[PDB]
Every structure is written in structure tokens, then in C-alpha cells.
């Protein structure tokens, strides 16, 4: 139970040790999907409009299709707000963003 | 330290063994774990009409519960757009898509 | 070749050993890990009114700010209509949500 001679041993094998030592890269290789999983938040805004928002319990399919290229626009929806155009501007922006939440923060 | 007989001696606890010795397959199990997550971004959607569309700070209720019921309906939405009825038409859909490409690549 | 002088032998070097014996717990860490990425599908309902949700290919983001505090009412929509300031008024949500099924089951 659990040797020298018996860790050696599998190296004979040549079948059930691939399984038993592979498992140890396989650790760091499962780890990996949990990282690919964030590409969903991109395909849920996708999913959203392309199926259809509110409860779908087909025509806008064609229109929803432009989603395709959406990426490009989505990531310029966050940066064109915060600057505009020059990117000084959103030192402007920065400003005035820290005086909004003093509006918002009291009802 | 660490030995045939250590490894044996530790079946004698017969508590920290049981834990010690499952992980292993629990390992892979973790990535089931994660996988469950999947199907929580149909939980967004429903959180999405539920929440009261953009944060606002209602019937609404009654009809977006039944979206419990609609995570069938949610896995259909995908199904619907993309073949629509029969499962041959959507390898037609499956070439407009690549074709769409054409039409708002001009201009 | 794995022996009592040789698992006590990797302390000296005090480099590897670290290494190789951390991932053991890192490996609990990834659970921990994977539930980290759920949080993700409240910053999309953020970014859903923050940056547009239909294909978005001056004054609407000085709007959107006010979702910066809107964060904490963003939780409150569900916590409210759901439970309803006390919880025995989620009681009430319990059964609701039961009784919801069978008027969506007709439509």
C-alpha cells in the first residue's frame, strides 16, 4: 500500500498511470473554463436581443443580426460616454462624474 | 514520515480519511460545479424583467415568476431564431448569418 | 521516487516545495474562484442600462451615472417586491410563487 517500489511500479503499466498522473496538469487545465466563462456576459446581451428580451413564452432576427458586429460598438458604448471622441475630455468627465454622486446621493 | 505503514495507520481515524481521501474525485466535480453556472444566466434574464428592466429604484411579478417555468421557453428562444420550426431550415439561417457579413460590409 | 527522505528533502529547498504543495488548497480556491464570476451577472445589469442593451451600433450618460449609486437600489428591486421590507411578507412570496404557475400554464 503506497511504496517506492510500488509508485515505480505503474511506470510499467503504460495505462492506468496516464489517467493517474495526467489528472495533476488536467487540475490547472479545469481551472481554465471558469475564465472562458466571461465571454457569456457577452453573449447574454446577444442572447437578450437576438432571442428576444421579455419572456419569449421572429422577424426582429434580421435587425438583432447587427449584435454580430455589436462587440465593436458595446466596448465603444462605456468609452465614447466617459470621453467622447478626445480622450482629455474625460479628465472633464472625471469631474463632473465625483459631483453626480453627490445629486444622486441624497433623494 | 509518509510510508506504507503511515498510510494505513491513517485508516484507523476513520474520520479525516474520508474527507482526505475524496477530494480527489471531488476535484472533478468542481468543474461540474462550475458548469452548473450555465444555467444560471438564464437566472439574469429573469432577473433582468424582474428587477424592473433599467434600475428604477406590479404585475410584473405574477408574469416573470413563471419564467421559472420559462428556462424551457429561455433554451427554445435560441432554438426558435436560429431553425425557427423544422430542423433543416436552420441550415439555411446558419448561411445568412455568414451572409449578413455582405450586406453590412458595403458602405 | 517518493520515500520518507524524499518528501522531507523539497523543505530545503524551499522554492518548489511551495509550489507543489499550495495547489492542494488552490484547488478549493477555484470553487471560491467560480462562484467569484456570478457577481459578473450584476455588473451586466449595469452595463445593460450603462452602455444600451438593443444594437447601440451627451445626456444619456450623465443619466447613467446615477446608476453608480443605483447599484444598491439595483438589489433593492428584488429584495423589495420579493420579500417586501420584513420577511414574513416573503412568506407570502413563497405561496404566491406556487399559486403564480398555474396562470402562466394558460396563454
Redesign the interface.
Known amino acids: 500500500?503506497?511504496?517506492?517500489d510500488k509508485?515505480?511500479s505503474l511506470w510499467n503499466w503504460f495505462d492506468i498511470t496516464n489517467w493517474l498522473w495526467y489528472?495533476r496538469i488536467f487540475?490547472i487545465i479545469?481551472?481554465s473554463?471558469?475564465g472562458l466563462?466571461?465571454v457569456?456576459?457577452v453573449?447574454?446581451?446577444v442572447?437578450?436581443?437576438?432571442?428576444?428580451?421579455?419572456?419569449?413564452?421572429?422577424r426582429d432576427?434580421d435587425?438583432?443580426?447587427?449584435?454580430?458586429?455589436?462587440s465593436l460598438?458595446?466596448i465603444w458604448?462605456?468609452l465614447r460616454?466617459?470621453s467622447?471622441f478626445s480622450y482629455h475630455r474625460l479628465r472633464d468627465?472625471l469631474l463632473?462624474?465625483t459631483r453626480?454622486?453627490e445629486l444622486?446621493?441624497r433623494?
Do not use: H, K, T
Not at 1 to 4: A, F, G, N, R, V
Not at 47 to 58: K, T
Not at 63 to 70: D, W
Open positions: 500500500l503506497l511504496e517506492l509508485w515505480a489528472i487540475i479545469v481551472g473554463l471558469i466563462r466571461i457569456f456576459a453573449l447574454s446581451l442572447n437578450r436581443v437576438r432571442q428576444g428580451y421579455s419572456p419569449l413564452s421572429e432576427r435587425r438583432s443580426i447587427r449584435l454580430v458586429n455589436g460598438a458595446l458604448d462605456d460616454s466617459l467622447l468627465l463632473i462624474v453626480i454622486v444622486l446621493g433623494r
